[PDB]
Amino acid sequence: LANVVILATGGTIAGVDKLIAGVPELADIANVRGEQVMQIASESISNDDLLKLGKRVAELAESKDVDGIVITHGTDTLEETAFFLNLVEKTDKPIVVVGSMRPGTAMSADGMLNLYNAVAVASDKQSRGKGVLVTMNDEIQSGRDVSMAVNIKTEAFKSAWGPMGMVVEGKSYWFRLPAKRHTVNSEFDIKQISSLPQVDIAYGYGNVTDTAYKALAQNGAKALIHAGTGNGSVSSRVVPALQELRKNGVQIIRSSHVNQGGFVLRNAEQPDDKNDWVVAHDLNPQKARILAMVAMTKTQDSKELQRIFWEY
Amino acid sequence: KLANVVILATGGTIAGGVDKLIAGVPELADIANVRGEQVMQIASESISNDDLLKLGKRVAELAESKDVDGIVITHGTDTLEETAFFLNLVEKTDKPIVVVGSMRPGTAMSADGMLNLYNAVAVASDKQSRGKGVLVTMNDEIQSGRDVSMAVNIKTEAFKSAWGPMGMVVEGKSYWFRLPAKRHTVNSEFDIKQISSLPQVDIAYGYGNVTDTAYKALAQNGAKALIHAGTGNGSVSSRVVPALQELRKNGVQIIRSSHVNQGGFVLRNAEQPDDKNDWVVAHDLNPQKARILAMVAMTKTQDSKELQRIFWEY
């Protein structure tokens, strides 16, 4: 039986010793122990909190008493945390992040079976080397590109590229493998990362002005994620500010709020080569912010950052 | 005999000269009597509130003409969904209004704009379109202009609703499967005739480690309402809540939307105490649609309870 550690951080899914005893079936599939890393509403997570989790995961992944890791998380920023760990945890021990749409007290609460599934997946040989996984709604989803896409409903977490597998009666069924760099094959490592650069997001829409972009740069943004309309499109009213910001050294990364499929193509809506800007590829704005913040611990070259947005 | 449809051109990839747009689809003559006006020529990502008003006012003039049976607007994809929702709210006409764009220019291999334009004119000329509110006719679908959104990049199936298409248009014929449930057009309390300016409304994104910086800056630079594009069920970071309380007391409306746009909606009092803070939830409306509804609504009211009702009815 695999040794699995549950790291509790908070969220609608939640005292971690109670949490575990509340699912006695876990003892059947793994030797489980729990730790409370933090106790937060995930919409209120800070970069300090994400680093603390990254570090504690890394200490446990190096432990020989540890075969797999489950992180219980609020839904709101689950996808951010999952992508972060996918970039910085250089381990091929399974890492699973899991949450719930309903509290354990509610009628037909989803957390119990989610937590069982997460433990089952974290204890499975098939999970090794696959990168960070999310196990809600009987699905095995990639930590890279899974997002909270539907509110209220238990099927909240979706990817444009589909689920990789399913978990049913504690067994894993795989249909797809990841194509993007992660974990063991990442050039980033939480062991060398003690801090993260400031990165912020501004939204594009009808009649948008340069105000948010300038303010976020004035208050410390080292990169801005542009959550554009369409294919990362930028208002003629905002282009001149982004050019001035890039000249002051702020990276300009074009994402979009067009999140169900496709990607943002370099040089299509804007002259990225000429302006020395970066396209976020298929990554939504929150995900683009996590990859930018991790990438900028290593490089400030816009051409290297574009390679990173195309490989991870 | 044939319906009189006017095509109002605003720009976009579908035109990437209204007379050549129309010459480029000879078959339009089989299905309608068509004429074109260039209202403007823009990239829709650059659209302004003055452009919306100008368009809205032109549409209303044509809707009031006995020589106009239906109206097609050709438009860039990027903010098409915003224009369509705006018109659905302010045009008090049962006459069809159809908004249409394309994902490829007319010169591209397998360009989508010719059939999209034929289908928009067919829908604008069809009796079944009357009273339905504003429609968008891309990818053979009849989508509601209220809740269709550009949800897929690059592909021709770019426009999707959480509540499904209402119908399809094939070989110029409309096939209906659903009807609108929300207030629109003829049953709207809003009227472009009585709107001479729109209040400034801005949007700020919610994410891990977000600060109150954009919220304050946008308010300092004139926003009368802020659309919070929150994580999850419109959730607000405990770091930002005090700023949004101070802004609401300063008179700025706080509307909780989300970046969780494929289905569900934001529930009042669930993630934040809205009643206690005098905030509004945007229900199912994504941030850019919540901005349009806030802007139109605040031409008539600043009562947060009336705003909430309006977000539950439109």
Add this chain to the structure above:
Amino acid sequence: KLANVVILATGGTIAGLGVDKLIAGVPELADIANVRGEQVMQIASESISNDDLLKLGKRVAELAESKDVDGIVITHGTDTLEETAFFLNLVEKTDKPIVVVGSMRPGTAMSADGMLNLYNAVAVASDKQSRGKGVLVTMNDEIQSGRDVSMAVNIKTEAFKSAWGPMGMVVEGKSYWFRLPAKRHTVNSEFDIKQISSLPQVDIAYGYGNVTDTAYKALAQNGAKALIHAGTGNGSVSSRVVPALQELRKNGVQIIRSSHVNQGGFVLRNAEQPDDKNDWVVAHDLNPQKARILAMVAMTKTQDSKELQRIFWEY
């Protein structure tokens, strides 16, 4: 003052148990309705008969005619829930709410879906916004039309989908509507369970590579009055099958072209087959099992293929 809701139990994984145990399992039902139960049958829905549908339809009609009933819930196996819901949508001439509900997991399983699905079914059945909307299905916090919801995803609780989207959602017992039905149903239907004592025999044959006329001929030989063709693509028919279907039509068997292309679009008349020349019918957007229900009900009234096609275009 609470609404009177009756639960008609028929079996399924939601009861994996008497109706009295289903009601006892959700003690919060007492807060939103005066609930009563009746065990109509205890079956696996994959095993349902036409006699079971008729029986359930007549129980629904008597309860809908009762001044002491405000709404009706049917608990049902998932497998043919979509078939029961569409059948009731065609033959029940009541504006009273009729809700069909099931579960993917039994009540003793971890994170079982049944309790909340049954709470929400009763909530919707009790709500005045549900009146006049036709038969509803309330799973996964959704209000789905009984006309065109189908079991589309195995295992997961989001099993039930419509090509035309959910019509609303049910959250904390409250109903939130975003679309209305367009097609004819219930109070504006030309069909009535009160005038139906038997259902014509209707069967389904599948289209695929190398398919032959075998299944079509055997089903007609063993009494089918109509064959639903589950075609490839736009209800396409193999050149190896067309001759047999011409002969079956010539001999009185209606030929209805549906498809196994079930996530969107519909089957277009005269596009893949000359339906006018052949006197055949297209099933529009209806999947094969739904088309069989509509065909069955329609042929209680007409054997005229142009009336059948009008029906497939209006319901």
Add this chain to the structure above:
Amino acid sequence: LANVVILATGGTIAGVDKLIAGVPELADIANVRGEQVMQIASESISNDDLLKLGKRVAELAESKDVDGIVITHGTDTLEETAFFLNLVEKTDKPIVVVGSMRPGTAMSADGMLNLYNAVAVASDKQSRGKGVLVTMNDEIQSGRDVSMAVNIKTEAFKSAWGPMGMVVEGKSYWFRLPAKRHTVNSEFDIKQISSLPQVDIAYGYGNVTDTAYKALAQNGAKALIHAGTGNGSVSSRVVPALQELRKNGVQIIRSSHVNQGGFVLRNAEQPDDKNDWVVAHDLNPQKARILAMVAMTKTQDSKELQRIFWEY
């Protein structure tokens, strides 16, 4: 430039030299020649057509001067041909199957760009080793589990497990890899198959009887795909007939007409171990028919068939 061969089989997309003439941009990206292998409406395809195509593909894959192959195909059984090839073609040269939803004479016809993208993917080194691919609507879809899911519209082809990539301006962007056995790692080879076993499909629905199942076996079926309700469920009126056919040597494979996601679970709805039946896992009835025909060229052991249905 890669040498790509286009094999025309018919369909709405379409003689092959006018097909190629129709897309003059093709010469820019590969050296293309056509052959007309057949001219059929794909709804009327036979087992002999599949074998003739599969053999012609295998000869071209062996040739030194062929870098990749495109098949132009009617949409109706495109998903059956694509899967068949994925199972029997032992090459890691790209094979791409492509059709169109509208004829080339129609307003906004999809066939020109679909044919361009197919040739582009067929000429890309990224396509080697990936299995058979389908390239419509700008997507790279797996031949294994892509299915005609939407009528009329150009987004007709979908997979429960999502697109593996996209093709844009002739360039391939990958996000997922296949997990199931295909082409070079398949235990099947078209070189050894002279004719396929007869396999038929019967539909499950309310008030279904054993008639179709009986008539198909009486007329030569060696396996029956049951297109069940739900999780491959079987009516109590049908089970006895299927026990009797299994006893007389006919394989019984439980598929479903629940085709948007999930799969059919062994022993859940029916006692497959006791009955010596097989479940089709996630494969839809027409795909499970292809796999049953191929598997049965090799084995008649139901435990080996179940293994095959779990690995392919």
